[model samples]
Target: LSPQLEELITKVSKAHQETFPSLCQLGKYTTNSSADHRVQLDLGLWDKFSELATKCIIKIVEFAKRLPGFTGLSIADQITLLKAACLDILMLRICTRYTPEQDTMTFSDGLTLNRTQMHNAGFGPLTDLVFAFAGQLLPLEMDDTETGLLSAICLICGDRMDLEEPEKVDKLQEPLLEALRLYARRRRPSQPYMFPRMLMKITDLRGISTKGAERAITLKMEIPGPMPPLIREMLENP
Candidate 1:
């Protein structure tokens, strides 16, 4: 991988770990029947998770600034790359929270909603929007390696079914597949060796996403359960 890609992957990997710890950890089961649903309504946890996610985003923007060839691209291309990839990053961050143990994932407002509750919680439209956006992004002529990398990133993040709806997952697959195909077609000829590496990298990335999600949730007071105000303050200020 290019140094730029390497640096970005590293930074994002770290940021993800810090932002969603609970969902990242290995659970004993997948029923989420034992998950504490009331944890979703905690204002304190929302503040903490949002703050952590925002910090990770700041790091992402910082890494973008430091990318070796970022400024060399035409202004339009810079914006295009950012626009095309930003949501993917956010979606990755959000989806990484999938935990088989709780059979639930945390969301923007510190809500620990399950699949059914998530559908009811207003992410149904957001999930569809991501699918539509991915669809539109698929037709663009991205490099084969980048497309493969991005697709792997999406799958490993578990972005597809984190919402827990079958039709939604089906609809989302089109754009993701399209983007992968477009990328593969564009990149295969230039850097054939990276293909295997890219494929392998996805597995590591998924494991990383899972572990990171778990940490973020466990550290937050409102995820699996409520936090004491004292602990919440410590997490926030520290």
Candidate 2:
């Protein structure tokens, strides 16, 4: 038991479990959309995605606070990182849940959405955009521990814009990178190359989340109402 590394894995794992629902814990359900249209949609239907996303956002806020060194950041930076990384993590969390054999994805409550329904529920053109990423995550097949560390690296990294303490953030992220490196190597002794493969995914995810936000930016004007302020702006709606 490499005491320190083992402990770090367990801590992150516990934090992940507390914050996210393991798929098995969900009693997955399905839906049918008479027609799927990325070209157009209704605001009334947006709740199916927005409300579910809100629950995940709340859990992510909690997960961020619980992660080591996260609460230690300045309050503004805490929210700053949360806003920056929220969609990326959401996209990552959702993509990894894809059961492509059935072309379905499951959410926290166990509700499953096939790509058609996924498109109906706010994916818009961003639908296959996510499916494409799921194709790669399918290979990594990371355990919850790596997922948490990977997600942690996304939020806590120094490169995020508008941070007051960039160096401080980087210092905190240093351990997460090493922990994931060591943990992945030890867990996958037969598959040593997987570590770098996972690391390289960081930018691809960044692009997806950026594009994901943009999808909503254009889509928002089509549906006007009291958009939830947080997801609204992160999606960059006027």
Candidate 3:
């Protein structure tokens, strides 16, 4: 890799680590949503999850701003990229907390929710697929650096509609792509397909997020109140 690309790898990896903690680093906590059979939405849990989601969104914005040349894009283009990838990033974020043995996913604040609870939390039918995606991710055994770089790659893409400088955005993504490949390879030389598989996940994330946005629309009517303001902002911008 070129010196600039190496520098970018370092910078992005650092920013990612700083912004989000690894699952290992978080305190071990659990919730008992499966204790009873009734599928009830815990408004309190939703409030906490929504709050955590909103905070994570801000962190993602901070991460995007740190990426080289991200702020250099026109404001509209920058917002376009963020809107396109925010839910993808959020899906990745929550899935990273997966504990396969327990079949649970935890939040940054150690709020552990089972698959049933996830469904109750408005994931609805998307719960199983999301957990499956998380289980698939486990074999990759991706470290925070890999996850961070991958998230950055997902965020700084050129294909999002209405970008004023698609070429510039594409150029930025190229280095991140190269950096991830190099990093993943060095980490797992025997796993030649790991890089490609990880890239394929970006597509999966898009599909999940698309459905999630749709689910959010229907959920608005079923739930007791509006989604958090930041979540509303995400859906509106997208």
Candidate 4:
């Protein structure tokens, strides 16, 4: 790869590592939402999760802007890409918090929720599948560099509708794809399928994100008020 592409990859990888820490790195805290049988939403927990989610969204935007030629795209295209991939990025962000031993996922602020709290927090029927996805992710053993490049590839896709310059987006994604393949191979040459499997996970992420959107609609009925403003922006704009 050219030095420019290598530099872009390093930049994105660093941004992701700095912006989001691994589950082990966070201060761990537990919640008892699982102990309660009530099916009602936890407004407070949802508020906290939404706050963390919003911060991740901002970091994702920052990562995208740092990509080669990403900001050079039309402003409308920038917004379009962010809206299209925001939920996928969010799912990846939260899933990275998976703790297999406890069967829970942690948030940025260290709030850990079990399957039940994940449901109460608005996953509802999608809880099991999301957890399952997280469990599946454990096998890949991807580090921050792989995760970051994969996320960039997910966000800079040429196929998302409403792109002002799909070719430009495609050009940007190509190096990311190459970078991820090379990195994954170098890390685990024996697991040659790791790269393809990771790409397949993006498809799974899209499905999960679709379910998340549906859950958001149902959550509107159960909760007394609107979703966080940034979340609403992502849902409405996309």
All candidates: TM-score: 0.35, 0.93, 0.94, 0.94
Quote the RMSD, in angstroms, for model 2.
2.2
Clashes of each: 21, 2, 0, 0
Q: How well is each residue in 62-181 modelled by candidate 2, as lDDT tens digits?
A: 888988889999997888888888998898888878887888888888878777777777778788879988887888979888998898888897887789999999998887888999
Q: Distance (Å) between predicted and true CA of 42, model 1?
A: 15
Candidate 2 segments whose C-alpha is farther than 4 A from its true place: 35-39, 42-44, 236-238
lDDT of 3 by residue, 55-174 (tens): 999999999999888999999999899988999999998889899888888887777877877877767667788898888888878888889999999999998888899999999899
Q: Native-vs-model 4 lDDT?
A: 0.85
Error at 93, model 1, angstroms? 2.3
Give all candidates' CA lDDT scores.
Answer: 0.41, 0.81, 0.85, 0.85
Candidates 1 and 2 compared: the better one by TM-score is: 2
RMSD of each: 14.5, 2.2, 1.6, 1.5
Residue pairs clashing in model 4 are none
Residue pairs in collision within model 3:
none
TM-score for predicted model 2 compared with the true structure: 0.93
Tell me which residue pairs clash in candidate 2: 28-110, 233-236
TM-score of 1: 0.35
CA error at residue 35 for candidate 3, angstroms: 4.5
What is candidate 1's lDDT per residue for 10-116, written digit by digit as tens? Answer: 44344334433433253423223313443234344344545645554554444444433444444544443443334345555455444345545564344565554
